[PDB]
Amino acid sequence: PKTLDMGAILADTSNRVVVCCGAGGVGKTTTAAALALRAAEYGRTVVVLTIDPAKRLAQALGINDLGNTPQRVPLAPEVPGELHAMMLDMRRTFDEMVMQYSGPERAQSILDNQFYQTVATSLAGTQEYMAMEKLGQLLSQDRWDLIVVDTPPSRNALDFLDAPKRLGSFMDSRLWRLLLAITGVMGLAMKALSTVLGSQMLADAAAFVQSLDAGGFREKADRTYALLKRRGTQFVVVSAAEPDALREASFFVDRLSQESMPLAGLVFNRTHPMLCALPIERAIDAAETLDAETSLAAAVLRIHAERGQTAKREIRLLSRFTGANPTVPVVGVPSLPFDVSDLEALRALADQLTT
Amino acid sequence: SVGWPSRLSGVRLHLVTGKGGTGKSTIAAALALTLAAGGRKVLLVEVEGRQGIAQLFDVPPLPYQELKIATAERGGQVNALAIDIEAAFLEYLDMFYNLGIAGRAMRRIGAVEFATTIAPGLRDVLLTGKIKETVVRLDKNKLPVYDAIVVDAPPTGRIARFLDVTKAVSDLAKGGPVHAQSEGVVKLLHSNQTAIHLVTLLEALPVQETLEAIEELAQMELPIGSVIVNRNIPAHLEPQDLAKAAEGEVDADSVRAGLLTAGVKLPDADFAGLLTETIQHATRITARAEIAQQLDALQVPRLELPTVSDGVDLGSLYELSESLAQQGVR
Numbered sequence: 223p224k225t226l227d228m229g230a231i232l233a234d235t236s237n238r239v240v241v242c243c244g245a246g247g248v249g250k251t252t253t254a255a256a257l258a259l260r261a262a263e264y265g266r267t268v269v270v271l272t273i274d275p276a277k278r279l280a281q282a283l284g285i286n287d288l289g290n291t292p293q294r295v296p297l298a299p300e301v302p303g304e305l306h307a308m309m310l311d312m313r314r315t316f317d318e319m320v321m322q323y324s325g326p327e328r329a330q331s332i333l334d335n336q337f338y339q340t341v342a343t344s345l346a347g348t349q350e351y352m353a354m355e356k357l358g359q360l361l362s363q364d365r366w367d368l369i370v371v372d373t374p375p376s377r378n379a380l381d382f383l384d385a386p387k388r389l390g391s392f393m394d395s396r397l398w399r400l401l402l403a404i405t406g407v408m409g410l411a412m413k414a415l416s417t418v419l420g421s422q423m424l425a426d427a428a429a430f431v432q433s434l435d436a437g438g439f440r441e442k443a444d445r446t447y448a449l450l451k452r453r454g455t456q457f458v459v460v461s462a463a464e465p466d467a468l469r470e471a472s473f474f475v476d477r478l479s480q481e482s483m484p485l486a487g488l489v490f491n492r493t494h495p496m497l498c499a500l501p502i503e504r505a506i507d508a509a510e511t512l513d514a515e516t517s518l519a520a521a522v523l524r525i526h527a528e529r530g531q532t533a534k535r536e537i538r539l540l541s542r543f544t545g546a547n548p549t550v551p552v553v554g555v556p557s558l559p560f561d562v563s564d565l566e567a568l569r570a571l572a573d574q575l576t577t
Numbered sequence: 578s579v580g581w582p583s584r585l586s587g588v589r590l591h592l593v594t595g596k597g598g599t600g601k602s603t604i605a606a607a608l609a610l611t612l613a614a615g616g617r618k619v620l621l622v623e624v625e626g627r628q629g630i631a632q633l634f635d636v637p638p639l640p641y642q643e644l645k646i647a648t649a650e651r652g653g654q655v656n657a658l659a660i661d662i663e664a665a666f667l668e669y670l671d672m673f674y675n676l677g678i679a680g681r682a683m684r685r686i687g688a689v690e691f692a693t694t695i696a697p698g699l700r701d702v703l704l705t706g707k708i709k710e711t712v713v714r715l716d717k718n719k720l721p722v723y724d725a726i727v728v729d730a731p732p733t734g735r736i737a738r739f740l741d742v743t744k745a746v747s748d749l750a751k752g753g754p755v756h757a758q759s760e761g762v763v764k765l766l767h768s769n770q771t772a773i774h775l776v777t778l779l780e781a782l783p784v785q786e787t788l789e790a791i792e793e794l795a796q797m798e799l800p801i802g803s804v805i806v807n808r809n810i811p812a813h814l815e816p817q818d819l820a821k822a823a824e825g826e827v828d829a830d831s832v833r834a835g836l837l838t839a840g841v842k843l844p845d846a847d848f849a850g851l852l853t854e855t856i857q858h859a860t861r862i863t864a865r866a867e868i869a870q871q872l873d874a875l876q877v878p879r880l881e882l883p884t885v886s887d888g889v890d891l892g893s894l895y896e897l898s899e900s901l902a903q904q905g906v907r
């Protein structure tokens with residue numbers, strides 16, 4: 223099993239974009255932030271596009287605000303590079319997209335539309351589409367040698383690669399103009415919508431189609447996705463030591479391989495390495511004899527045995543991934559005895575990531 | 578103190594919410610099994626089109642039909658209903674507007690999918706309307722078809738809006754029979770016949786979302802049932818020993834002594850390793866207890882479910898159902 227060398231990938235300035243993928247709740251945001259921090263410590267001018275940092279982490283980075291733009295993260299004077307961070311504002315990115323293509327005058331009408339504000343901006347795939355759009359904004363401004371991209375949480379790891387295109391095709395549906403903004407079939411559908419939906423809502427929906435005046439959305443999603451194919455892009459798949467997260471990582475590795483997209487490797491996060499070499503069978507028996515004979519030493523032995531069983535499941539999970547993907551470099555990150563919610567804890571995480 | 582007050586046994590509609598990945602689907606299925614035991618008939622409902630029941634029982638996708646999915650203890654039955662929002666919209670068009678023709682034409686051009694996507698209020702009206710239909714349905718003997726309905730519900734971030742019948746109805750066509758039905762939905766939801774259960778993990782975000790959801794729902798005068806703490810782990814340490822070990826203090830002498838009695842002698846590098854393993858465990862339990870303490874402020878009954886070692890399978894659902902029954906769930 224090949225060891226993933228995140229340190230060498232971060233230190234090499236031919237790698238311009240690092241995308242942190244996988245299911246939600248595996249450590250993607252903290253991995254992205256820790257990678258970006260270490261790259262700054264190696265001398266790089268880095269921006270990290272975070273999606274959903276926990277309150278404390280967002281504050282540790284100075285990004286707890288409503289801004290939708292990078293800001294410098296103040297670091298120790300010894301740090302030779304620069305770290306910049308932001309948290310994605312999904313709604314504000316939709317506004318910026320609307321204005322870029324519709325213009326500032328027309329955008330005043332679209333942004334004021336109740337259908338846009340309540341429905342259009344909260345559709346399935348908006349978080350993935352806006353993350354891709356924001357990545358596209360960061361790349362066009364050519365202000366950073368490295369962009370570290372965090373991806374939105376989902377039960378499905380492929381939503382990052384599929385949800386923007388899917389949302390684009392839905393936005394470009396013929397049904398928008400023909401059913402809201404005559405025929406026998408379109409007329410029957412139109413009559414049914416007028417009969418069931420509220421007049422106010424249909425007027426707002428029709429005004430959005432007329433105002434927007436967009437295969438616009440799919441073409442945008444396609445062009446932005448093409449940036450992920452530029453030379454210097456690296457994908458990092460993050461997974462917890464759980465079966466659901468690993469399965470999701472494998473679906474993502476397959477896709478990257480099919481699409482000939484460069485994969486750095488897998489970050490197998492929250493592991494429980496054994497610190498004591500005592501066998502499980504031995505520990506269980508040693509605790510069992512003490513019960514029938516202080517009491518602290520038996521609980522201590524029970525902790526160890528429980529950790530060893532946990533380590534055993536993690537080893538067999540990883541070996542199944544590794545067996546199926548012998549080509550994929552891997553790095554095991556232990557579960558740290560503190561929350562990864564400050565710069566000091568990001569540094570300890572990055573030490574694990576870069577060994 | 579009790580995790581299941583008696584008033585919860587008179588509830589016909591159980592809504593199981595909680596943050597994403599906390600255990601809603603698993604727990605809703607375990608709850609349905611618990612309520613079906615003793616010759617009862619319970620309906621397990623899912624409303625998001627995600628086919629989570631089929632996935633949980635490891636079967637192909639379920640059609641829009643109430644079908645027997647499990648046998649409960651002593652001749653009980655659990656039926657499954659994976660609501661198909663498209664078929665529900667056509668059903669609604671046909672029953673309330675006699676637009677079955679227009680509806681079948683719409684399905685052929687993807688217009689039902691469009692309409693339910695672009696009008697979230699219509700989606701909730703169809704979903705909550707179908708939920709109400711299964712609850713109030715009667716047999717030939719004017720007795721309820723189901724003893725209870727368990728809804729594997731939307732998550733904590735969406736549960737209050739999903740149950741906001743007034744806001745859902747707001748952007749629908751004025752007049753007709755849809756407004757008379759919605760009054761019945763509100764009455765059912767704001768009654769002793771309904772209870773919203775909130776699944777949580779002993780983690781910061783699932784607990785914050787639980788507290789925030791309870792506050793939105795209480796403001797809406799919606800009935801709260803229980804907070805269900807999923808995937809509990811053993812502390813395996815006494816409160817004083819645990820509090821000490823969370824600070825790095827473990828009594829090596831006392832540990833070395835107890836290891837001699839058990840016929841185990843450990844090298845210095847392995848003994849030190851064994852101690853930091855217990856410090857790391859103690860630190861996790863302590864942090865989990867600090868998080869759990871935030872729920873103590875709620876004068877809400879609490880249930881606790883253990884962690885299933887291997888992948889949650891059919892046998893696991895029965896273990897969790899059994900764990901619920903032991904806590905008074907009936």
Ligand SMILES: Nc1ncnc2c1ncn2[C@@H]1O[C@H](COP(=O)(O)OP(=O)(O)OP(O)(O)=S)[C@@H](O)[C@H]1O
Pocket residue numbers: 377466595596597598599600601602603604629732807808882883884885886888889
């Ligand atoms: N008590 C438990 N012990 C062990 N694993 C569990 C337990 N409860 C749930 N799980 C697993 O945890 C994962 C999430 O549980 P689910 O029941 O699917 O959660 P959920 O709240 O329905 O998630 P979403 O929001 O629908 S993705 C699944 O892999 C379950 O099998």
Ligand SMILES: Nc1ncnc2c1ncn2[C@@H]1O[C@H](COP(=O)(O)OP(=O)(O)O)[C@@H](O)[C@H]1O
Pocket residue numbers: 245246247248249250251252253274275276375491492555556557558559560561562563571
């Ligand atoms: N190796 C680790 N050790 C300890 N805690 C970790 C580790 N990696 C992540 N965490 C914690 O796990 C939680 C989930 O991490 P996060 O990066 O926000 O996940 P995701 O973006 O994948 O949903 C956070 O509280 C984070 O601090």
Ligand SMILES: [Mg+2]
Pocket residue numbers: 247250251273274275372373374375
């Ligand atoms: Mg995240």
Ligand SMILES: [Mg+2]
Pocket residue numbers: 601602629
């Ligand atoms: Mg579910």
